Amino acid sequence: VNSFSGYLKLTDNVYIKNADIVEEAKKVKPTVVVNAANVYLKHGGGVAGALNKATNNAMQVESDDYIATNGPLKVGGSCVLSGHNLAKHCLHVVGPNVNKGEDIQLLKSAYENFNQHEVLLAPLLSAGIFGADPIHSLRVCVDTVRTNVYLAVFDKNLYDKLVSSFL
Ligand SMILES: FC(F)c1cccc(CSc2ncnc3[nH]cnc23)c1
């Protein structure tokens, strides 16, 4: 039993809700919140900009030190950093950005990072400003993630489409 509330169950391990991931994280304080990161951990917009704003820029300060030490992530890769006031940990995951021409096949590799964590609150990778089809992202999530994932979808119209079209 966990503290996630109001989710629709899609499969044995995947759950979905129309919610602002920032507000959901602040309420649940999950062990892991997933950020829709880029390789530079520059949290300017989309989910990343919102999560970072909610940390009063502490996420960005920590991320800049991470990059200065380690260099950029790989597309499809991840790193674990602090969750600040939102969660115990933040798993920064880089899905391919279609608006940069990145290989959509890397979306499966990106979701594989979730399997290193028993339970996660997450957005749909590569959706939103990353330019991929969210219906496809949900399919890859369900077919790749085996751990327990609670997906927050900000847009109510998109949420209803994802549910109604789910096979
Ligand atoms: F305007 C900003 F300052 C701000 C402040 C607080 C909350 C939010 C919404 S979070 C979000 N953004 C994008 N895609 C998503 N997919 C799931 N969640 C999200 C945005």
- CATH number, domain at 123? 3.40.220.10
Cα 46 to middle of ligand 1, angstroms: 6
C-alpha–C-alpha distance, residues 167 and 165, integer Å: 6
Nearest CA to ligand 1 atom 6: 50
By the 8 A CB rule, do 124 and 35 touch? no
Q: Tell me the one-letter amino acid at 47.
A: V
2 falls within a domain: no
- Experimental approach taken: X-ray
Backbone angles phi, psi at 69, to 5 degrees: -85, -40
Is the minimum distance from the CB of 47 to ligand 1 under 6 angstroms? yes
3 falls within a domain: no
C-alpha–C-alpha distance, residues 34 and 114, integer Å: 9
Cα 107 to middle of ligand 1, angstroms: 21
Indicate the pairing of strand 148-153 with strand 119-122: parallel
57 falls within a domain: yes
67 falls within a domain: yes
42 falls within a domain: yes
Q: What separation, in Å, do the N-terminal and C-terminal C-alpha atoms of the chain show?
A: 26
Resolution (A): 1.0
Is the minimum distance from the CB of 21 to ligand 1 under 6 angstroms? yes
Closest CA to 136 of 148, 126, 147: 126
Cα 125 to middle of ligand 1, angstroms: 14
1 falls within a domain: no
Tell me how many domains the chain contains: 1
Cα 54 to middle of ligand 1, angstroms: 10
Nearest CA to ligand 1 atom 8: 50
Is the minimum distance from the CB of 53 to ligand 1 under 6 angstroms? yes
Q: Which residue range(s) make up the domain with 104?
A: 8-163
Q: Tell me the one-letter amino acid at 126.
A: S
Cα 48 to middle of ligand 1, angstroms: 8
Is the minimum distance from the CB of 26 to ligand 1 under 6 angstroms? no
Instruction: Locate 98 and state its tokens.
Output: 């279609």
Backbone angles phi, psi at 37, to 5 degrees: -90, 165
According to the 3-state scheme, what is the secondary structure of the chain? CCCCCCCEECCCCEEEEECCHHHHHHHHCCCEEEEECCCCCCCCCHHHHHHHHHCCCHHHHHHHHHHHHHCCCCCCCEEEEECCCCCCEEEEECCCCHHHCCCCCHHHHHHHHHHHCCEEEECCCCCHHHCCCHHHHHHHHHHHCCCEEEEEECCHHHHHHHHHCCC
102 falls within a domain: yes
148 falls within a domain: yes
Residue with tokens 């602002």: 20
